Amino acid sequence: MTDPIADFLTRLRNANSAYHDEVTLPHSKLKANIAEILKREGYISDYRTEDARVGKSLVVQLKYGPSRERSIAGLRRVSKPGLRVYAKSTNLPRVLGGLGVAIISTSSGLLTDRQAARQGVGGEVLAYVW
């Protein structure tokens, strides 16, 4: 065991791809905020955290429209261990040419491409979903 957030994203990818309408997860604050912003922009339905094995657990509902179709298009951690990634205010990448959204853990907290561009600080980007 080396990487928890990559396993977070891998479980999201498999669970959404394998047509499951929910996924369960240990609640470390990192993935908590990742799914929080995910529902904030609406690629998932709704996340709720309750009590579990010694920590807590976050349960995520994936947003499916009129059919079994996922608002999520895909997930991929970029700033992985061994290849951790930093970015600045100017060259803030635009997800899917700007269509999608990203995660950038700013010194001021957590922000996406557009938010950080409106503000202008950088330092650590993460996965992006479109």
């Binding site: 922009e41 609406g42 690629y43 429209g65 608002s71 298009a73 040419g97 700007g98 269509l99 557009r114």
Partner: protein, 198 residues
């Protein structure tokens, strides 16, 4: 594809609507080993399209080159396909595959031009593209390259799709960048419609 320019006293030549640009990429001779002999047939890959953009792909396995061409044309008529774009650009860079063939596509500055390989040039210009950038790799072939072209094209959609998926509108979905590009596209379309109205 021999002696196609004919002017006779017969009835007609089968002209119809759908003033579609046609293209054929390649035909390889196909050898069936009958007991002690070789029968030779043809395999045509036909790509039909419109300057509006909508595309069709057909595949005629016929022992005759004109029969193969006709079979490909009618399969493309059966197997059509639609592509969304932005003026003369692509809505977003994409990658497509056919089992060994990889194709990368990217929007370009207006008027840049369709810079694409021989097969890709055909598969693209049959659509409504005028200015995008693209390339391909792998498969050391053309059938898979053509097949992957449509695979990449399939990953194309309007910003409305991500707007509905997010529930949130454009902006994050379609930022000013594309916003102004699609505004130019639709404004040119509206101006053309107004001009054609009179």
């Amino acid at each position: 594809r021999g002696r196609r320019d004919d002017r006779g006293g017969r009835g007609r030549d089968g002209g119809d609507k759908s003033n579609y640009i046609e293209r054929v990429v390649s035909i390889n001779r196909v050898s069936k080993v009958v007991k002690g002999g070789r029968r030779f047939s043809f395999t045509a890959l036909v790509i039909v399209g419109d300057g509006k953009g909508m595309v069709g792909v057909g595949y005629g396995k016929a022992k005759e080159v004109p029969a193969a061409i006709a079979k490909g044309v009618e399969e493309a008529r059966k197997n059509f396909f639609r592509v969304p774009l932005i003026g003369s650009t692509i809505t977003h860079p994409v990658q497509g595959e056919a089992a060994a063939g990889v194709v990368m596509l990217r929007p370009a500055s207006p008027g840049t031009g369709v810079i694409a390989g021989g097969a890709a040039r055909a598969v693209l210009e049959c659509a409504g593209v005028h200015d995008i950038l693209a390339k391909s790799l792998g498969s050391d072939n053309a059938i898979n390259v053509v097949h992957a072209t449509v695979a990449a094209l399939k990953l194309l959609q309007r910003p409305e799709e991500v707007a509905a998926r997010r529930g949130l509108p454009i902006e994050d979905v379609a930022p000013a960048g594309m916003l102004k590009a699609r505004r130019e596209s639709e404004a040119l379309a509206a101006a053309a419609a107004r001009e054609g109205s009179a």
